[PDB]
Paper text:
The ribosome is an RNA-protein molecular machine that coordinates the vital process of protein synthesis in all living organisms. A Bbu hibernation promoting factor protein (bbHPF) and two ribosomal proteins that are not annotated in the Bbu genome, bS22 and bL38, are found in the Bbu ribosome.
This class of 12,449 particles was used to reconstruct a Bbu 50S subunit structure at a resolution of 3.4 Å. The protein densities corresponding to the full-length uL30 and bL38 proteins were found unaltered in the 50S subunit structure, confirming that both these proteins are stable components of the 50S subunit. A surprising finding in this 50S subunit structure was that the long and usually well-resolved 23S RNA helix H68 was not even partially ordered. One explanation for the H68 disorder is that the 70S sucrose gradient fraction has some not-fully-assembled 50S population. Since no proteins are missing in the Bbu 50S structure and the only unusually disordered 23S RNA region is helix H68, it could be a late 50S assembly intermediate structure. Another explanation is that this 50S population is formed through splitting of a small 70S sub-population. With such larger motions, the H68 helix could therefore play a role in completing the dissociation of the two Bbu ribosomal subunits.
Author numbering:
A (entry chain f): 1 to 50
B (entry chain D): 1 to 277
RNA sequence: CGUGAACCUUUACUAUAGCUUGGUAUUGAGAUUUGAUUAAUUAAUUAGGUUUCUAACUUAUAGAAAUAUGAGGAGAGUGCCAGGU
RNA sequence: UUUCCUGGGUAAAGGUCGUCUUCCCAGGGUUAGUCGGCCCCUAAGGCAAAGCUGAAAAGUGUAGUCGAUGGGAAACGGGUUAAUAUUCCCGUACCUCUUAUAGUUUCGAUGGAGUGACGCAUGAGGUUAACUACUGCUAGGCGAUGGUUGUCCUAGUUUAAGCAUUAAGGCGAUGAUCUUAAUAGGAAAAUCCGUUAAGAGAGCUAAGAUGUGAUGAUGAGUGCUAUUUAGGUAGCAUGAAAUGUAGGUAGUCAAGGUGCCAAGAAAUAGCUUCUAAGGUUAGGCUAUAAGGGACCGUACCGCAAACCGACACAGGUAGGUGGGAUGAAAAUUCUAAGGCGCGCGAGAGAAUCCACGUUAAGGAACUCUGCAAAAUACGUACGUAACUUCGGGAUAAGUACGACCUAAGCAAUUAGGUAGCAUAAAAAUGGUCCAAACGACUGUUUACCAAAAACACAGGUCUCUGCAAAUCUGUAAAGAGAAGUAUAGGGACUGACACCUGCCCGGUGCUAGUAAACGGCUAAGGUAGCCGGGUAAGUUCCGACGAAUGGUGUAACGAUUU
RNA sequence: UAAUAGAGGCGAUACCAGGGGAAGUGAACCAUCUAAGUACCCUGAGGAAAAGAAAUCAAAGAGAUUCCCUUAGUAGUGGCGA
């Protein structure tokens, strides 16, 4: 059964990448929150996939 | 013009008719320097929502740059090169080749033929295809492609088989009977094209099957009584109701006779007698 | 069952989008008689009715803009107040 | 994302064991001018100075700039390593340019124009990889057991890009290259305006074929040393054994040709060409010689224990290769190359569960129900009703034949002989008819209990809207509608087609009227139409409410109901 | 276009100022009200901010602004219900 996570890469980087996060207000809030919490991974761009 | 019918070799062909394209200089590809490829619309707007429903994916078509505004080419005769099929509108398009070398498209009137010479301006003769300001066109003629504001182009009647009737002239204005049937005043300096628009069998066609309706880019229409009350004021069809309510649009606006034109519009001065039901 | 929750409907109640009417600001100058009121038909104001000219204002073309030309018009549009839906 | 290769090891983990593993540890492994990106271009789309619109945050949106699954310069064969190759090597091509030399002349822009540039259906025709039909030709065998040194058997007989030669076919003489006069083009032009007076002009495109590439490489085999399960296998040498005919698939010619309407991307790239400001070896073109290749990906899995399903999971998983025999075919079955023998097994077979095979007599008597099974099935012929919109119904129904050998015959098939219980001998490959209900029919939906009578639908009717339209989303701007224009757009209703669709304006909607409005039938009381048979035995079935939330019929159709 | 000068963002899941501003509740319902300028959003800077030297308080004779103790659960307000 084709299911929930057909894994593209251009979709991954475009929709959830660091530049897509910085591109708007809420994404920058996301980045600040994750920095404050001290996450080891900020965005999907830490998975080097292009 | 003409209608071509089909023998019923399938249950869908029994009532399919199409036009016959004999009055068309066939075998034609559009002029490469006047047509550009384009998307198909499907009725979504800049925000991305659907603003007009029930419009979908038809046949891919190019856009032909028409010219409803022949004003900047007054006094310059041109030649009719060909009569071509246009997918973006009902009527056919004529390709005029001007004496200075520029080529343009116009709406093809009824009864012109290849090789004719067409002229635009106050001095042009009264001949089918010529464009003249309403000043110069005599009372009692039939025109089309009427301009509404000087320099705007033909914004009035344009569809296949239509024409407008000049009734009277007075002051700055000319009374014109439009195809809907109302009598409207037009400023006398706007231009118009003489004669009816050809291709008058366009609407005598019986489409024949749901597939062709899909080709024409028309998605299916879902009635209101087939809905649920969350979806449409008419919903609730537990055994085929009729709405249980005076008929309304999907947004609550009444639909059987309700008049939606604004009650104090700016153009009310220029409408003599509205159309008839 | 709980003075539970949510949804839906209606000629249940109460608000309100939107629509619509009036007044006013935007909003000027003319002509005319419909009047009311105040005194002596006359005179001073004022609501209107029928019309006019464009400079406010807004439609078309050219232009980045400015600006120009061709048409509408103190209307319309937009605020505020009030009356309906 | 190291799972790849080599070596070592078995805490765990592998549904068991384990010397093994995609497990663990160490080491090693991915070489590019020709591949895929990067790059120069644009589709949808995103951002977007200015302008405009909004408490803010922003929303719209022009000039522009980004955005491939698209369009654009260049390479093929063979070999080598424990693992990597159109990347290294051997042999052999091609495209870009930096400088210089020598035949030299109009170069120069984000600007203008052309090319770039396109659909579907569908024959037929020209050659062809692979493959078999036959023969030569090489290599081996010449067969524990009847015959088999010859119409014997087995295997092979291979080889590209590029260059050179030519040219099936298509488009062409209705004009395809060009040579000048005029220039309403917006930068102005010796190009494009392809618009017009001439009158000189048939070529363009193109698979394929041959040679070269190539006495090269490859090569079934044969030859030495080691190994050995006595079977072949590790290095290592050597070897055209036809670049034969016939048939011809899949491309390809072909973005072709012929027809149809639903009339079938853009490019500021590339190619070609044009002129301004500026230049007159400053450049450019035609050649030669020399060297300049960016940056990144490059292993392996990739129909699976390496991707996505919590798993080493009966799932999903793009595209190009698709052998041979049978056959019309990629069906069915068998089989070559190649890849595997499902990661708990072994004894006994009790009942029973589940999935199947066979059957005396009867043949739906079982059961809510011919549910499920059984059976029918192909090819070639004969023969096909009622009804009907004349298209269909229809493969209606029903009937005959099919092996082998010989002969006839282009072949289907015919005739004779012969064999069997069976002779479309395996498998695959429709059960049909009659009557009724509803729906016209293809189709679509309840992902995960409803595939239907529901929706969709062609058609018809009513109503709204004159274009800075109505309408829809927004406080707005703005956009959609629409680069559209009443033969149009939006909404409601009905639902192919045929006959009909009547009465009522009180009430409620809409602008006294309007019912193809909500609705009713005193405002007006509804117009048309809508026991018999079957069975021995039949609560089933068949025959004797209500008119555009539609009434009554109807050919054809249906994984529908009876 | 040129010239310098001051800003962009982060940090404090703290504080302050300005703008926007709910809903769960209580009133044993709810619509007034309450919760509440609460949460949160957005725009600003500072080390504090804001405010700050009376056209004021208020019937006492005081004298800028802000923060405490009292006045005081008082004066009033509230479908005079909470």
């Amino acid at each position: 059964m084709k299911r929930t996570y057909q894994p593209s890469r251009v979709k991954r980087n475009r929709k959830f990448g660091f530049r897509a996060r910085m591109k708007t207000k809420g994404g920058r809030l996301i980045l600040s929150r994750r920095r404050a919490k001290g996450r080891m991974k900020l965005t999907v761009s830490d998975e080097k996939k292009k | 013009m003409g209608i071509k019918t089909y023998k019923p070799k399938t249950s869908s062909l029994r009532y399919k008719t199409t036009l016959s394209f004999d009055d068309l200089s066939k075998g034609n590809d559009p002029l490469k320097s006047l047509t550009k490829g384009k998307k198909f619309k499907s009725g979504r707007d800049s925000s991305g929502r659907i603003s007009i429903r029930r419009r979908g994916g038809g046949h891919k078509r190019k856009y032909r740059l028409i010219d409803f505004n022949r004003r900047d080419k007054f006094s310059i005769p041109a030649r009719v090169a060909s009569i071509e099929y246009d997918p973006n509108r009902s009527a056919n398009i004529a390709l005029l080749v001007y004496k200075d070398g520029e080529k343009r498209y116009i709406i093809s009137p009824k009864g012109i033929k290849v090789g004719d010479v067409l002229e635009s301006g106050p001095n042009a003769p009264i001949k089918i295809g010529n464009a003249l300001p309403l000043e110069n066109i005599p009372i009692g003629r039939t025109v089309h492609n009427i301009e509404l504001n000087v320099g705007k182009g033909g914004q009035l009647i344009r569809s296949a088989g239509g024409y407008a009737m000049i009734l009277a002239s007075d002051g700055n204005y000319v009374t014109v009977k439009l195809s809907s049937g109302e009598m409207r005043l037009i400023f006398k300096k706007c231009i118009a094209t003489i004669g009816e628009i050809g291709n008058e069998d366009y609407a005598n066609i019986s489409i024949g099957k749901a597939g062709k309706s899909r080709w024409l880019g028309r998605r299916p229409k879902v009635r209101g009584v087939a809905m649920n009350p969350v979806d449409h004021p008419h919903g609730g069809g537990e055994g085929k109701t009729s709405g249980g309510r005076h008929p309304v649009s999907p947004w609550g606006q009444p639909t059987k006779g309700y008049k939606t034109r604004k009650k104090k519009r700016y153009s009310d001065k220029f409408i003599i007698k509205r159309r008839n039901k």
